[PDB]
Amino acid sequence: IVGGYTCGANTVPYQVSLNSGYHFCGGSLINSQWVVSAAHCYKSGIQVRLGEDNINVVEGNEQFISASKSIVHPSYNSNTLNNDIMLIKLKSAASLNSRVASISLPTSCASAGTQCLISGWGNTKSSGTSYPDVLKCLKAPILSDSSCKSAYPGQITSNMFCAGYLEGGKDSCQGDSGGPVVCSGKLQGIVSWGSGCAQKNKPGVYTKVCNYVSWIKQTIASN
Numbered sequence: 009i010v011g012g013y014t015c016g017a018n019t020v021p022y023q024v025s026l027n028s029g030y031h032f033c034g035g036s037l038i039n040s041q042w043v044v045s046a047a048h049c050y051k052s053g054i055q056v057r058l059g060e061d062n063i064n065v066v067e068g069n070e071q072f073i074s075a076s077k078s079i080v081h082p083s084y085n086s087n088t089l090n091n092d093i094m095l096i097k098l099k100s101a102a103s104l105n106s107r108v109a110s111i112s113l114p115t116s117c118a119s120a121g122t123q124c125l126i127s128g129w130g131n132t133k134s135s136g137t138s139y140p141d142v143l144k145c146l147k148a149p150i151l152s153d154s155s156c157k158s159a160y161p162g163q164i165t166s167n168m169f170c171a172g173y174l175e176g177g178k179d180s181c182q183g184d185s186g187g188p189v190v191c192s193g194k195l196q197g198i199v200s201w202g203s204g205c206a207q208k209n210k211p212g213v214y215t216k217v218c219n220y221v222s223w224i225k226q227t228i229a230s231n
């Protein structure tokens with residue numbers, strides 16, 4: 009997250025870190041045994057780390073649980089990033105508490121102008137590289153479909169939305185991928201892609217979660 013703020017320990021209780029020897033992507037806990045992330049975060053050997061603040065220090069609220077199963081969206085296209093969503097099942101159910109909690113799925117899509125909370129352990133610099141130890145946060149509005157399409161000609165599908173600031177300075181970044189965009193207490197987006205971080209006229213692009221609620225629910229019901 010570039011241009012954000014320190015969230016505060018365990019204040020984003022649905023935020024998970026995906027670890028394969030190191031943090032490599034975010035995700036969102038949606039029930040005691042399932043995480044939503046980005047399909048482009050897929051790999052084998054995932055340990056889901058819940059209850060994290062500093063990802064380099066054991067601070068006492070962590071739960072580390074291996075994945076038992078990954079399910080990349082049936083229609084994910086890694087070239088266009090259309091349908092950039094995957095589900096991860098935990099080998100055991102997480103213990104839910106005030107610091108480790110699921111986030112509600114949308115009942116309805118969100119509209120441009122809605123404020124949302126974006127979070128992660130990704131790069132905090134738009135030029136160069138500095139990766140934080142503690143969780144970072146950014147409040148950002150959803151942008152209109154027309155603004156998003158103007159910023160990225162030929163690239164925005166019905167499964168994507170832009171959020172952030174056209175002027176630059178505030179955005180998600182590499183290492184935030186897969187993490188949450190929460191609006192009004194609902195998971196509306198997944199950190200997906202863009203062009204660089206926090207550059208003028210290049211806002212972040214997010215997977216539009218409301219389009220996937222039926223698939224998420226029916227996948228969970230049979231897996």
Ligand SMILES: NCc1ccccc1
Binds near residue numbers: 183
């Ligand atoms: N600045 C948007 C973004 C997020 C994650 C990865 C690449 C780009």
Ligand SMILES: [Ca+2]
Binds near residue numbers: 060061064065067
């Ligand atoms: Ca920790």
